[PDB]
Amino acid sequence: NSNICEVCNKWGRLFCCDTCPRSFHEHCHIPSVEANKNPWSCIFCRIKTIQERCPESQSGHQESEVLMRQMLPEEQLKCEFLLLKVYCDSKSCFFASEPYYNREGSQGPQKPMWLNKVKTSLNEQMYTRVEGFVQDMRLIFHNHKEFYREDKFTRLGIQVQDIFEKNFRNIFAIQETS
Ligand SMILES: [Zn+2]
Ligand SMILES: [Zn+2]
Ligand SMILES: [Zn+2]
């Protein structure tokens, strides 16, 4: 196994996957690492199994169809993995916890959003379709862009949204376009 957390790349109290060499802190893994279960497989392994059980799941999809899907177990897992993939980038730190807004010449967004709130929302099964989760994710970056305006800090939101969007297209097998 690895000696660092796959998500935050630090050492500490880790839990090791039984079917791959990754390891995780308890609350870096999503869902949080399960109390018992021996063996234990991590989210990367679970996602791989879904693909291997239904190879045609990797043929192209239209985003519109994906968004309308109900959050049944397999879609729930895929959104948890996509959330995880964002927390894997160190720039997610800017978007994790509840933000506040007091900048000369800007007003705060009408609907604040942050990653830990989405995490909690997924945990408490508050989204009924993929669209719900995707909307909150994109809201995070959109709020950031609107608030920071011409400050170069806006770029952080562009960069982390690019991470989200590449992973979204991969995990949900969105049809490749030019
Ligand atoms: Zn970690
Ligand atoms: Zn694994
Ligand atoms: Zn099949």
Looking at the structure of the chain, the number of domains it has is: 2
| CATH number of the structural domain spanning residue 163 | 1.20.920.10
Q: Are residues 97 and 175 in the same domain?
A: yes
CA of 108 to the centre of ligand 2 (A): 40
CA of 175 to the centre of ligand 1 (A): 32
Ligand located closest to 30 CA: 1
Q: Are residues 31 and 119 in the same domain?
A: no
Experimental method: X-ray
| CATH number of the structural domain spanning residue 55 | 3.30.40.10
Q: Are residues 118 and 105 in the same domain?
A: yes
Ligand located closest to 54 CA: 3
Residue that finishes a domain, picked among 44, 59, 74: 59
Determine the Cα–Cα distance for residues 56 and 25; give it in Å rounded to an integer. 33
Determine the Cα–Cα distance for residues 65 and 102; give it in Å rounded to an integer. 39
Buried b (16+ CB within 10 A) or exposed e, 26-51: eebbbeebeeeeeebbbbbeebeebe
Ligand located closest to 9 CA: 1
CB atoms within 10 A of CB 154: 16
DSSP 23: E
Q: Are residues 44 and 85 in the same domain?
A: no
Domain that holds residue 149: 60-178
Q: Are residues 26 and 109 in the same domain?
A: no
Quoted resolution (Å): 2.0
CA of 52 to the centre of ligand 3 (A): 9
**14: helix, strand or coil:** strand
